[PDB]
Symmetry: D2
Subunit: 251 residues, 4 copies
C-alpha cells in the first residue's frame, strides 16, 4: 500500500522510475502529456502493480489540482512525490534565445513543480512518517556554464525551494530532497535541440553518461530511506564528468 | 549620456536609487505600476536630470517589449539596468500558502526579471564596455529560512541566472551582477504581510537594518565600476544580522 | 578482493562502518590512535573477514606514508578510502577559543585529510574502476552557525577539496565523494566538550539524531556505487533538523 | 588615528593596498618575510603616514602573538585587519603534487590566517564600531577547476570561516568579509610556478586581468563601509573571465 506520484513518466527518468518502483510492489501514479505512452506503460506494468495514469500538463495548476483531488482510493495516499517533469531548450547563448522558450522552461521546472507540490502538500503531510518529496534538480542548479541561462536558474530555484520546504515542514515527518543529476542520455537533449538527433548523438559519443535507470534507482533509494533520515541534496555525475578551467576571453 | 533603467522605482530601493543616480547626473528611466507616485518622483528629479517614466508591469512580456521599443532617443541607450522589481508574500509556512501568492512571486521575480532582460539584451550589448546588468537578489537566494519557500527560491533563480548570463555575454563587455541585500526597512514587509504595518513594525525594532538609499549607493558603486571588472555577486547584510544555529525539532 | 581504508575507526562512523563493511565481505584496514580499541575491534571482526589494524595519527604524514607502504599483500589493493578521522572543539564563540583547539582541528580535519589522500592516491589510481575516496564532510561545510568557526571552515575545505580532486582525476575512474552528515550521536560532542558526557546528553535529548550506522550504511552505499557514477556531495540530515530564521541583534 | 594590519605586503595585493590606505591618512602596519621589500615600502611611505614593519611568517603563531603584543601604542589600535598573506603552488594535477607544497598552502592560507585572527581578535573587538576583518578569498573558494586542489579548498575555508566569524561576533560591530578576487597579474603565478616567468606571461597574455590596485581599491571600499553594514562576500572577476562548459572525458 505504498504509492509513488511520478510526473513526466512518459520518458527518461520518469519512465525508468515507474519500472523501478513497480519491481518493488509500489502502486504507481504516472502523469505526463503523451497519453498514448502512458497507456503503453500502463499495459506493461499493470501486471506487476496497480497503475493509475493521468494526462496532465503541470503548467496548468487547475488541471493538477483536479488530477490530485480525483485520485481513486487505491492511490490517494501518496508516500513519495517525484517532481521529475522538466525540460531544457535553446542551448545557444542567452542573447540568441526566443522568449517563448524561456517561458516554457519556467512554466514547467518552476511553476509546474510548484503546482504539483502545492496540490500534494496536504496529502504528503497527512501521510507523515516516511513521506518524501523528491525534486529533480540538476548540476546546472549549482554550476554555471554557457547555454544554461534559464535552465540552470530554474534548477537553482528547485534546489532552494527544496531547502526552504524543509524549514517549513519540520515536525511533519515529510522529507524533501533535491536529486541533482549530471549528464544522462534520455530524450532530454533531443527536446533541448527541438529534434536534432545528431546533436544528441555527438554529445554522448565516446563518453559514459548516466543511464535513465541510474537516476531511477537513486529516486528509489531516497524514497525508501529510513523515516528519521533526510537527504538535503545529492549531486550525481558520471565519473567521466567534472569541471573545466575558467573561461578567459582572449584577443 | 549615461542612462539607468530602474524597474520598480516607486518605493524602497528603486525610488532611493533614482535619487542617488540623479545626484550624479545620470539620466533616469523609471518604471513601475503605480504611475501616480512615479509622476511625483519625476517632478522632484526633473530638475537635476532628464526623467522618462513608464507604467509597466514586468509580468507582461508584450508590454515590456513595447515599453522598450517606445524609448526616446535621449534614453534608449541604457548603460545600467537594475532589475529591482520584486516582492514577497505569505510569511507563513509553505503548507499554509495559497497558490496565487506563489504564482505572483514567480510571475514577478522570475518571469518578470527575464522579461526585462530579454527586451534589453540587444540594447545593452550595443553599448558595451561599461554596460552592467544589476539583478537585485537577496540573502534568501543563498540561505534558507522558514517562511521563505518560493521567495528564496525565486532569488536563487536570480543568482544562477546572473552567473549564466555572464557565461553567454563573454566578449561583449557587458557586466552582470547579483546584488543580494539583507533585511532593510522598506515597503517590502508591508507587501509580504498584505498590509500589516504592525507586523512590519515588530521587525526592524531595536535593530539597525539596511536603508533604502544604502542599497542605492551600493547599486551606484556597481554601475560605476571600471569596465574591466565585474562583481558576480555581493551579499551585503546589516552587521546586526547573521545566522542562527540549526533548527532542532524536540518534544 | 575489495579492501576499505577507514581512518578513525575506534568510535562513531568509523567503528560502525567497519561492521557494515565486514557484513559484506570487504577486507578492512582500520586505523586510529586508540590501539587497544583497534585490537578489540580486530577480534570482533576477524571471524567474518580479514582485518588489518594500524596505530596511526593522521597528523603525521610520515607515519601515514609508512603505514600505507607497510600494507600486506592481502590489503595493499585499496578499493575505497574513507577519510573519516576528524574532530571538533570549543563550541564557544570564536573570541573565547584557545588557538591550540583551532590548530588541532586544522591538523586533523584538513592537513590529516590531505595526508591520507596523498599517501593513497597512487594506490587508488592503480585500482581504477570502482575506486572511491569518500571524504566525510559536514553540514557545517556549507551552512554557517554560531560555535562553528574553524570546524565548519575545515569541513568547507573538504567539500571544495573533493570537487577539485575530481577535476584532476578525470579519466582515472576513481571517484571522490563528500558525505556531509548532520547532527549524529557519537563520541563527536564528547570530544568537542573535552569529555563532558552531560553536555553530550543534553544536546541529543528529546530529538532523533542520526545514528553511527546510518552514516556507515551511507559510506557503503557510496563505495558500492556502479563504477560509472559519482556522488559529488550528499548532505544527509535527520528529518528533525533544519534551518532557523536569521539572527538579528536587538536592543 | 586609523591603523591597518596588512599581511603579505611584500608584493601584489598587500603591497598595493599599503599605498591606497596611505593615500587616505591611515596608519600602516605591514608584515611579510622579505624584509628588503618591507624596508623599501617603509621608506617610500613614511612620508605620507606612520609605518610599522614586521618580518613575520604567519605559520608561526607565537611570532604572530609576539608581533601583536609588541605593537607600539600608535599602532596597537587596529581598525581593519586584512588577511591577505597567501599563496598557491604546483598547478599540475593533484596526483602529481608533492605533499610539501600542499602543507605550505595549508600552513599559510588556513593555519596562517587563523593565527593572525586569533592574535588580533581581542584588539578588534575592543575597537568596536567600524572594525573589519577582510579575509582575502578567491573565486577558487566556490568554483572548482583542474589544478586548484588545495588552493581552492583553502579559499573555501576562508569563505566559510568568514561566515562563521560573523555568527560569533554578532553585536560587537566588528565586520568579517570574504573578498574573493578573480585572475590578477600579481606575481602570484610566478611564485605559484616556482619561478616560471614564461608560464606567468602566457596566463595573462592577450587578456585584461585584475590589477593589484583594483583589488586594493576594493579592500579600502569595504574598510570604509558604514559601521552598520557588512559585506558577507564579494566575488570580483574580470568581465573577460567566466565559466566554461562541463568537462567530459571522452574516447
Ligand atoms: N537528462 C539529463 O541530462 C538531466 C536531466 N535532469 C532532469 O531530469 C528530469 C527528466 O528529464 P529527462 O527524463 O532527462 O528528459 P526526458 O525528456 O526524457 O523526460 C522528459 C519528461 O518531462 C515530461 N514533461 C515535460 N514537460 C511537461 C509538462 N509541461 N507537463 C507534464 N510533463 C512534462 C515529459 O513527458 P511529455 O513530454 O509526455 O509531457 C517526459 O516524461 C527533467 O526535469 C530534467 O531537467 C537533470 C539533470 C540532467
Ligand atoms: N526589503 C528587503 O529587506 C530586501 C529586499 N530585496 C529586494 O528589493 C527589491 C525591491 O523591493 P524593496 O526595495 O524591498 O521595497 P519594495 O518591496 O517596496 O519595492 C517593491 C517594488 O516592486 C515593484 N513591483 C511589484 N510588482 C511589479 C510589477 N508587476 N511590475 C513592476 N514593478 C513591480 C513595485 O513597484 P509598484 O508597486 O509601483 O508596481 C515596488 O517598487 C525586491 O526585489 C526585493 O526582493 C532583497 C533583499 C532584502
Ligand atoms: N558526529 C557528528 O555529529 C558529525 C560528525 N562528522 C564527522 O564525522 C567524523 C568522525 O565521526 P564522529 O561522528 O566524529 O565519531 P567520533 O568522533 O566518535 O570518532 C572520531 C574518530 O576520529 C578519530 N580521530 C580523531 N582525530 C584523529 C587524529 N588526529 N588522528 C587519528 N585518528 C583521529 C578517533 O580515533 P582516536 O580518537 O582513536 O584517534 C575516532 O575514532 C569527523 O570527521 C566529523 O567531522 C560530520 C558531521 C556531523
Ligand atoms: N593573484 C591572484 O590572481 C589571486 C590572489 N588571491 C589572494 O590574494 C593574495 C595576494 O596574492 P598576490 O596579490 O599574488 O600577492 P603575492 O601572492 O604576490 O604575495 C602575496 C604576499 O603573501 C606573502 N606571504 C606568502 N607566504 C607567507 C608567509 N608564510 N608568511 C607571511 N607572508 C607570506 C608574501 O610576502 P613574502 O615575501 O613574505 O612571502 C606576499 O607579499 C594571496 O593571499 C592570494 O591567495 C586570490 C585570488 C586570486
Amino acid at each position: 500500500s505504498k504509492v509513488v506520484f511520478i510526473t513526466g513518466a512518459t520518458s527518461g527518468f520518469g519512465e525508468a522510475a515507474a519500472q523501478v518502483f513497480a519491481d518493488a510492489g509500489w502502486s504507481l501514479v504516472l502523469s505526463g502529456r503523451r497519453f498514448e505512452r502512458l497507456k503503453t506503460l500502463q499495459d506493461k506494468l499493470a501486471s506487476q502493480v496497480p497503475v493509475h495514469i493521468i494526462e496532465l500538463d503541470v503548467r496548468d495548476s487547475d488541471s493538477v489540482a483536479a488530477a490530485v483531488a480525483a485520485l481513486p482510493a487505491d492511490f490517494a495516499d501518496i508516500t513519495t512525490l517525484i517532481n521529475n517533469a522538466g525540460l531544457a531548450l535553446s542551448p545557444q547563448p542567452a542573447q540568441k534565445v526566443d522568449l517563448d522558450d524561456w517561458k516554457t522552461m519556467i512554466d514547467t521546472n518552476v511553476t509546474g513543480l510548484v503546482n504539483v507540490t502545492h496540490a500534494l502538500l496536504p496529502t504528503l503531510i497527512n501521510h507523515g512518517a516516511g513521506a518524501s518529496i523528491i525534486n529533480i534538480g540538476s548540476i546546472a542548479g549549482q554550476w554555471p556554464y554557457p547555454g544554461s541561462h534559464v535552465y540552470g536558474a530554474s534548477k537553482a530555484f528547485v534546489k532552494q525551494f527544496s531547502y526552504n520546504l524543509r524549514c517549513d515542514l519540520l515536525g511533519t515527518g515529510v522529507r524533501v530532497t533535491d536529486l541533482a543529476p549530471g549528464i544522462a542520455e534520455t530524450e532530454f537533449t533531443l527536446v533541448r535541440t527541438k529534434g536534432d538527433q545528431a546533436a544528441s548523438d555527438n554529445l554522448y559519443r565516446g563518453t559514459t553518461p548516466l543511464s535513465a535507470r541510474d537516476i531511477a534507482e537513486q529516486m528509489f533509494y531516497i524514497a525508501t530511506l529510513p523515516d528519521h533520515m533526510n537527504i538535503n541534496r545529492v549531486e550525481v555525475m558520471p565519473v567521466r564528468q567534472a569541471w573545466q578551467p575558467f573561461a578567459i576571453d582572449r584577443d
